[PDB]
Amino acid sequence: QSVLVQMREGTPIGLTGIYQHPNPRPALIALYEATLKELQDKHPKDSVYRQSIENLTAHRKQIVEDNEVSEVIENKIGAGLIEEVVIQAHEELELAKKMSEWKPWEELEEKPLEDQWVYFN
């Protein structure tokens, strides 16, 4: 399937370039479930990154599942308007897709030198 994350033409909104997004919450909860599924499948359960984004998107998805109207969920979420929120959930989905390729839970590959990181005491 395919999902819409940002209207680039439609009913105007306070931000320029964003417009009003029809049916924000099904797109929102589907984008959440994609983040949950890919993040559970491809990251190790020890890692702190996986733990907090699983908890974070579980918290946001709980808020979106509970309340029925738009203006109250966007107060409980804490981010901007829900068009902007759908852009953010999209963005963290793409981030969680990139992190499985980059694999950052490994120990660091390039250790610094001792002469590196000195600043005049």
Binding site: Q1, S2, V3, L4, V5, Q6, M7, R8, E9, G17, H90
Partner: protein, 63 residues
């Protein structure tokens, strides 16, 4: 072709008394035949230059 009409309306304006009631209708018909070619021109937007500064109409469909 608009200039040539404006100089074609110049013989009439000097003889407007002589051709009473008759050359009036002929000049009406002449001007109306011109006006429909003019509304062709304004419906085609021939003299307007568009802008290729499109605001990215197409939205963000994903996956």
């Amino acid at each position: 072709p608009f200039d040539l009409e404006i100089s074609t309306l110049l013989p009439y304006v000097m003889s407007i008394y002589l051709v009473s009631n008759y050359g009036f209708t002929i000049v009406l018909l002449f001007l109306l035949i011109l006006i429909i070619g003019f509304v062709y021109e304004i419906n085609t937007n021939a003299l307007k230059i568009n802008k290729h500064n499109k605001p990215n109409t197409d939205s963000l469909i994903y996956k």
